[PDB]
Design an enzyme around this catalytic site. Structure first.
Site, PDB file in Angstrom:
ATOM      1  N   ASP A  95      13.072 -11.232  -4.478  1.00 18.71           N
ATOM      2  CA  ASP A  95      12.546 -10.339  -5.515  1.00 18.71           C
ATOM      3  C   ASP A  95      13.569  -9.260  -5.959  1.00 18.71           C
ATOM      4  O   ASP A  95      13.263  -8.039  -5.969  1.00 18.71           O
ATOM      5  CB  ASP A  95      11.227  -9.759  -5.037  1.00 18.71           C
ATOM      6  CG  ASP A  95      10.432  -9.095  -6.159  1.00 18.71           C
ATOM      7  OD1 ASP A  95      10.882  -9.090  -7.317  1.00 18.71           O
ATOM      8  OD2 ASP A  95       9.368  -8.509  -5.866  1.00 18.71           O
ATOM      9  N   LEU A 105      10.753  -9.432   2.368  1.00 22.59           N
ATOM     10  CA  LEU A 105       9.337  -9.108   2.667  1.00 22.59           C
ATOM     11  C   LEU A 105       8.339  -9.846   1.795  1.00 22.59           C
ATOM     12  O   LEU A 105       7.152  -9.806   2.081  1.00 22.59           O
ATOM     13  CB  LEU A 105       9.054  -7.597   2.540  1.00 22.59           C
ATOM     14  CG  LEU A 105       9.760  -6.760   3.610  1.00 22.59           C
ATOM     15  CD1 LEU A 105       9.630  -5.300   3.299  1.00 22.59           C
ATOM     16  CD2 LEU A 105       9.188  -6.992   5.009  1.00 22.59           C
ATOM     17  N   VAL A 143       3.277   4.491   0.810  1.00 25.94           N
ATOM     18  CA  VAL A 143       4.542   4.733   1.508  1.00 25.94           C
ATOM     19  C   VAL A 143       4.732   6.230   1.511  1.00 25.94           C
ATOM     20  O   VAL A 143       4.579   6.940   0.459  1.00 25.94           O
ATOM     21  CB  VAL A 143       5.786   4.030   0.879  1.00 25.94           C
ATOM     22  CG1 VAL A 143       7.078   4.365   1.633  1.00 25.94           C
ATOM     23  CG2 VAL A 143       5.637   2.529   0.810  1.00 25.94           C
ATOM     24  N   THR A 154      11.765   3.026   7.604  1.00 30.67           N
ATOM     25  CA  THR A 154      13.088   2.740   7.001  1.00 30.67           C
ATOM     26  C   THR A 154      13.873   4.003   6.702  1.00 30.67           C
ATOM     27  O   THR A 154      13.337   5.118   6.786  1.00 30.67           O
ATOM     28  CB  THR A 154      12.986   1.931   5.685  1.00 30.67           C
ATOM     29  OG1 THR A 154      12.434   2.765   4.645  1.00 30.67           O
ATOM     30  CG2 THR A 154      12.090   0.680   5.872  1.00 30.67           C
ATOM     31  N   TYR A 169      15.481   6.664   4.307  1.00 31.36           N
ATOM     32  CA  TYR A 169      14.891   7.390   3.162  1.00 31.36           C
ATOM     33  C   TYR A 169      15.920   7.576   2.030  1.00 31.36           C
ATOM     34  O   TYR A 169      17.088   7.923   2.281  1.00 31.36           O
ATOM     35  CB  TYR A 169      14.363   8.747   3.625  1.00 31.36           C
ATOM     36  CG  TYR A 169      13.946   9.672   2.498  1.00 31.36           C
ATOM     37  CD1 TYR A 169      12.817   9.369   1.748  1.00 31.36           C
ATOM     38  CD2 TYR A 169      14.675  10.860   2.183  1.00 31.36           C
ATOM     39  CE1 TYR A 169      12.403  10.183   0.722  1.00 31.36           C
ATOM     40  CE2 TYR A 169      14.265  11.699   1.144  1.00 31.36           C
ATOM     41  CZ  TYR A 169      13.116  11.330   0.424  1.00 31.36           C
ATOM     42  OH  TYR A 169      12.606  12.046  -0.615  1.00 31.36           O
ATOM     43  N   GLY A 195       0.825  -1.214   0.000  1.00 25.82           N
ATOM     44  CA  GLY A 195       0.000   0.000   0.000  1.00 25.82           C
ATOM     45  C   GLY A 195       0.851   1.251   0.000  1.00 25.82           C
ATOM     46  O   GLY A 195       1.956   1.233  -0.460  1.00 25.82           O
TER      47      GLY A 195
HETATM   48  C1  LIG Z   1       5.813  13.426  -6.854  1.00 25.06           C
HETATM   49  C2  LIG Z   1       7.076  12.583  -7.098  1.00 25.06           C
HETATM   50  N1  LIG Z   1       7.410  11.837  -5.859  1.00 25.06           N
HETATM   51  C3  LIG Z   1       8.662  12.266  -5.177  1.00 25.06           C
HETATM   52  C4  LIG Z   1       9.879  11.759  -5.990  1.00 25.06           C
HETATM   53  N2  LIG Z   1       9.891  10.287  -6.115  1.00 25.06           N
HETATM   54  C5  LIG Z   1      10.457   9.504  -5.049  1.00 25.06           C
HETATM   55  C6  LIG Z   1      11.600   9.935  -4.336  1.00 25.06           C
HETATM   56  C7  LIG Z   1      12.112   9.165  -3.305  1.00 25.06           C
HETATM   57  C8  LIG Z   1      11.485   7.920  -3.044  1.00 25.06           C
HETATM   58  N3  LIG Z   1      12.029   7.130  -2.037  1.00 25.06           N
HETATM   59  C9  LIG Z   1      11.524   5.905  -1.496  1.00 25.06           C
HETATM   60  C10 LIG Z   1      10.429   5.205  -1.986  1.00 25.06           C
HETATM   61  C11 LIG Z   1      10.041   3.972  -1.336  1.00 25.06           C
HETATM   62  C12 LIG Z   1       8.845   3.183  -1.797  1.00 25.06           C
HETATM   63  C13 LIG Z   1       7.670   3.893  -2.023  1.00 25.06           C
HETATM   64  C14 LIG Z   1       6.490   3.271  -2.412  1.00 25.06           C
HETATM   65  C15 LIG Z   1       6.448   1.892  -2.572  1.00 25.06           C
HETATM   66  C16 LIG Z   1       7.639   1.179  -2.391  1.00 25.06           C
HETATM   67  N4  LIG Z   1       7.659  -0.214  -2.560  1.00 25.06           N
HETATM   68  C17 LIG Z   1       7.953  -0.736  -3.817  1.00 25.06           C
HETATM   69  C18 LIG Z   1       7.964  -2.054  -4.103  1.00 25.06           C
HETATM   70  C19 LIG Z   1       7.768  -3.017  -3.000  1.00 25.06           C
HETATM   71  C20 LIG Z   1       7.918  -4.416  -3.212  1.00 25.06           C
HETATM   72  C21 LIG Z   1       7.760  -5.315  -2.160  1.00 25.06           C
HETATM   73  C22 LIG Z   1       7.889  -6.810  -2.468  1.00 25.06           C
HETATM   74  C23 LIG Z   1       8.779  -7.710  -1.585  1.00 25.06           C
HETATM   75  C24 LIG Z   1       7.238  -7.806  -1.487  1.00 25.06           C
HETATM   76  C25 LIG Z   1       7.461  -4.822  -0.871  1.00 25.06           C
HETATM   77  C26 LIG Z   1       7.311  -3.445  -0.652  1.00 25.06           C
HETATM   78  F1  LIG Z   1       7.054  -2.978   0.566  1.00 25.06           F
HETATM   79  C27 LIG Z   1       7.457  -2.514  -1.686  1.00 25.06           C
HETATM   80  C28 LIG Z   1       7.361  -1.017  -1.476  1.00 25.06           C
HETATM   81  O1  LIG Z   1       7.062  -0.523  -0.373  1.00 25.06           O
HETATM   82  C29 LIG Z   1       8.833   1.776  -1.992  1.00 25.06           C
HETATM   83  C30 LIG Z   1      10.087   0.926  -1.831  1.00 25.06           C
HETATM   84  O2  LIG Z   1      10.204   0.369  -0.473  1.00 25.06           O
HETATM   85  C31 LIG Z   1      10.773   3.518  -0.217  1.00 25.06           C
HETATM   86  N5  LIG Z   1      11.864   4.223   0.251  1.00 25.06           N
HETATM   87  C32 LIG Z   1      12.713   3.801   1.371  1.00 25.06           C
HETATM   88  C33 LIG Z   1      12.240   5.384  -0.370  1.00 25.06           C
HETATM   89  O3  LIG Z   1      13.209   5.981   0.070  1.00 25.06           O
HETATM   90  N6  LIG Z   1      10.399   7.527  -3.729  1.00 25.06           N
HETATM   91  C34 LIG Z   1       9.884   8.258  -4.705  1.00 25.06           C
HETATM   92  C35 LIG Z   1       8.630   9.753  -6.706  1.00 25.06           C
HETATM   93  C36 LIG Z   1       7.348  10.358  -6.070  1.00 25.06           C
END
Ligand SMILES: CCN1CCN(c2ccc(Nc3cc(-c4cccc(-n5ccc6cc(C7CC7)cc(F)c6c5=O)c4CO)cn(C)c3=O)nc2)CC1
EC number: 2.7.10.2
Length: 263
Positions: free
Chosen positions: A126, A147, A21, A79, A81, A19
């Site tokens: 994965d 996970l 994050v 976690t 960032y 969901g």
């Molecule tokens: C408006 C633009 N925004 C700001 C800029 N940009 C941006 C910048 C920084 C960041 N930084 C970060 C994004 C995420 C993040 C965000 C949403 C979903 C997920 N994700 C993805 C795949 C996934 C797969 C599994 C599989 C194994 C079952 C389990 C999961 F839980 C996940 C999960 O949560 C993550 C990645 O954790 C996590 N961390 C730490 C960051 O730092 N993210 C996005 C994009 C969005």
């Protein structure tokens, strides 16, 4: 166990397998990502029981788990960032205009984190560019290792599911559910391909079904243009038909360090 009073939510980062994050602040100081676990998406008690082990996985190139909030619903996972987000999207941005040394360094970052996981006999299950993140210094870290075991969605966990990482999986995983250190090695080779091809989909003109057949017949991903013969040899070694003939992450690391010095 992090107190939720010590958390502030600032902005949405996206949606993953569990969901939404969010980016936020912990103890008014520290940048964090905070997973808000969507109810019904996760085997929560199992995750809670085994979050200890995961919290003790500590490496520079792993996205560090800081804590959980489990005395409430939905539960949170807090976690490290990663400012530049997901490695897959980072790769696809032509403006970075990467040097190949930078591409190999991205492989090395990941290999270091996987070598650590291997030493702890802990599988990712994965590994792919979408599951790596990039920090403010352009360092790549491995994210969401382990996970997959708590995902309740069958489209994700089943070999024949629409969300299963078919293109990153060895034949023995697809045919037999034979998971091991060598199935992470296979995925790591595919990940090197993703990096050197600047984020192309592996087997980009095949379906998941055709990809399973292609690899069961002994055929493999072509050399990306940006990859030298030696870089190609490293990724390709990861895709040996016999799992026991694939290298370890420790071997892969010495191979990457070699090419670095050589090229
Ligand atoms: C408006 C633009 N925004 C700001 C800029 N940009 C941006 C910048 C920084 C960041 N930084 C970060 C994004 C995420 C993040 C965000 C949403 C979903 C997920 N994700 C993805 C795949 C996934 C797969 C599994 C599989 C194994 C079952 C389990 C999961 F839980 C996940 C999960 O949560 C993550 C990645 O954790 C996590 N961390 C730490 C960051 O730092 N993210 C996005 C994009 C969005």
């Amino acid at each position: 166990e992090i107190d939720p009073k010590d958390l502030t939510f600032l902005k949405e980062l996206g949606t993953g397998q569990f969901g939404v994050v969010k980016y936020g602040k912990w103890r008014g100081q520290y940048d964090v990502a905070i997973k808000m676990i969507k109810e019904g998406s996760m085997s929560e008690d199992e995750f809670i029981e085994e979050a200890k082990v995961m919290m003790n996985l500590s490496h520079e190139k792993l996205v560090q788990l800081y804590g959980v909030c489990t005395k409430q619903r939905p539960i949170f996972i807090i976690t490290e960032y990663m400012a530049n987000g997901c490695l897959l999207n980072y790769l696809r941005e032509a403006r970075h205009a990467f040097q190949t040394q930078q591409l190999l360094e991205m492989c090395k970052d990941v290999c270091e984190a996987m070598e650590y996981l291997e030493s702890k006999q802990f599988l990712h299950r994965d590994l792919a560019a979408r599951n790596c993140l990039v920090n403010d210094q352009g360092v790549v870290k491995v994210s969401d290792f382990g996970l997959s075991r708590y995902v309740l969605d069958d489209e994700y966990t089943s070999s024949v599911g629409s969300k299963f990482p078919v293109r990153w999986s060895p034949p023995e995983v697809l045919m037999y559910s034979k998971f091991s250190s060598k199935s992470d090695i296979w995925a790591f080779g595919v990940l090197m391909w993703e990096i050197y091809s600047l984020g192309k989909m592996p087997y980009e003109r095949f379906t998941n079904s055709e990809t399973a057949e292609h690899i069961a017949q002994g055929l493999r991903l072509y050399r990306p243009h940006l990859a030298s013969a030696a870089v190609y040899t490293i990724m390709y070694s990861c895709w040996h038909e016999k799992a026991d003939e694939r290298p370890t992450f420790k071997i892969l690391l010495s191979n990457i360090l070699d090419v670095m010095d050589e090229e």
